[PDB]
Symmetry: D2
Subunit: 207 residues, 4 copies
């Protein structure tokens, strides 16, 4: 019923293209994983968590925001932190037709907020660190693929930075494993005016 071999072909494509813009390569890969068994299983397991199943039922997606208005919010709030680093540094839209296309949209609309709450950098290691945190909480295909990819590309092309990469991966997974409050379960558009330290405390980043 599922074409997993096309998932492997998509991963081989991803590894090979990266050995030669960069934002669209991940979207093309993500799309190729929709046909796999892990795509359906991820949806089946997320729908087992009540607050996540509610978002699937509602088809919840964050309200549009103006970066300039977010920047005008208090000093340590989610809005201010996100906007300040967006100006210092938006995705491929798909029609929501089923559970898989919904999860894809929920992920794309919200995942760039994750690293600010989780406490990871916008750099390569920070992004691999964040994936390890997500995988520890709620495993989805792209997170598994991006972790393996990360490990392979750093050890092959920049092995002098492998220890650093493993330090972020282990920290990410460890912290994510001890965070009961799932990132994916949050209605982010309602947290722009809330302190980042307060959000971390609500999710129980320490715990």
């Amino acid at each position: 019923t599922y074409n997993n071999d096309k998932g492997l072909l998509a991963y081989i494509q991803f590894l090979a293209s990266s050995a030669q813009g960069n934002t669209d390569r991940v979207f093309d890969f993500e799309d190729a994983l929709d046909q796999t068994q892990m795509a359906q299983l991820a949806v089946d397991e997320l729908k087992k968590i009540p607050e996540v199943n509610a978002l699937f039922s509602e088809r919840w997606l964050p309200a549009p925001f103006n970066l300039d208005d977010l920047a005008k919010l208090p000093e340590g709030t989610l809005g201010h932190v996100y906007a300040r680093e967006m100006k210092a540094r938006f995705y491929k839209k798909v029609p929501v037709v089923d559970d898989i296309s919904y999860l894809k949209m929920l992920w794309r609309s919200t995942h760039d907020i994750y690293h600010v709450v989780a406490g990871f950098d916008t750099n390569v290691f920070g992004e691999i660190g964040l994936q390890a945190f997500f995988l520890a909480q709620t495993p989805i295909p792209i997170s598994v693929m991006l972790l393996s990819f990360g490990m392979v590309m750093i050890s092959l092309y920049q092995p002098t930075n492998f220890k650093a990469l493993m330090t972020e991966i282990s920290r990410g997974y460890r912290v994510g494993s001890h965070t009961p409050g799932k990132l994916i379960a949050q209605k982010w558009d309602q947290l722009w005016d809330v302190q980042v330290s307060e959000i971390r405390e609500r999710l129980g980043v320490n715990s």
Copy 2:
């Protein structure tokens, strides 16, 4: 000075062949990684640990053993445990010409003993668990490649067993990170007559 692109080609070869005996596929892959920068770096970092550098200097390799004589040793000894499970279930030999060909031989001669001391099964998950333990202690290219491979092949082809795979990977890395006594640093041929619990205690598997 290093051909890393051939390392990526070797990994793509490995992923693709596995999607179709199995022992020789890993040896061919291992050999293809000798040309990479990570191969040299692994040697450079291992030689920084005194007891490991001594084995490189000596060109230490384990003495030949007769499985029947090992089985005749006491109940809980390394020899007895290894032999009992070998009979219930030997590799590609290369001439030792340099540091990389030495490490390859040391690895091949001894790595099948590792899982009995580390406490991992001979199955697929047990082997991926063991790699995570080794990577936590002394990172070498094959261990990184086999971890990524594991993660990708299970999530693509048997995703219903991904949680189980992550459970072994995390346990492996966690235990390995808390084991000061390096597996690679041991003169295994001198431990056949020593209790497994005693070896685990010497290496400080708990710590």
Copy 3:
């Protein structure tokens, strides 16, 4: 001095992506072949034919045209035929910095004219047939890659059309081998007002 392994990675990327827009995939591939030895050798061999070496000296590229003005030319002329089928059915620009970036631009600016003079369809088989005609005359890396790709993708995914593909490939090569007048050597912008039958006669398509 050349990275050929990256050429193989580009081909693997191309095959794998083509097993899942389509115009940019060929450009990305073409670009990845610039680093190979065949890229330089193709330039070295083309520069051995005087008429071609003349365009390399001038860094000749076709003058801009308005499709509506070309359509207004007499019945059987190159301009009229091209425009009529363009309306019934433009590329990635690169700065001309050397002979490889030059040949890439010459190819992209002019190759869509080739099929009208050569007599091949705009469809998949017509394009693979045209590449066979081009490889018979003046071999360049993309033609070789596009031919192999063609053969592999049809035999793997649509084998019921393999006989038809081999009919276009052999016709293309045969006709191209018997055409002394090289396509690549022509200053196309000077032939818009010339009959297609006259151009075919000048190039000696029969011969």
Copy 4:
């Protein structure tokens, strides 16, 4: 009903391994193509030629021979020529269970004789030329794959020999297209005592 994606994975495996014994790599690849649609279609099309369909009915395979006894035959006979060059320079056996396993065995048992009758060298280019002759007569998946592979590996890794490769490929295809007597249709074990010139005349190599 067929897994074509596994055929593509097998080709990617083959290309990548060939960028680093060599006899078994082709057999593993050949085996991976049995699951494709082209495998069945090749059998369906071969069984449409009566002389071939006769061998499919008998599941004909050549009788065993002693190389020393073949060498003792007259000067220009098939036996003598084959044996003389075998001594100057045998395969993976599979149980014949269906038409695909049959064609695989017929191919492996007899294909080394082909080059002596067809007039191609035992070298790399001679083998690629022979496959072109075979594809012109009776197309089977391995020939298509071996042709594409050939073209890609020479243009990527030894482009200075591409002209020579295209000379053998076009000669092979041209000669094969003009040979009515199919190689695959011959009961070779009955021709050991027949002159090579006589066999070429019977098959109509010129025609």
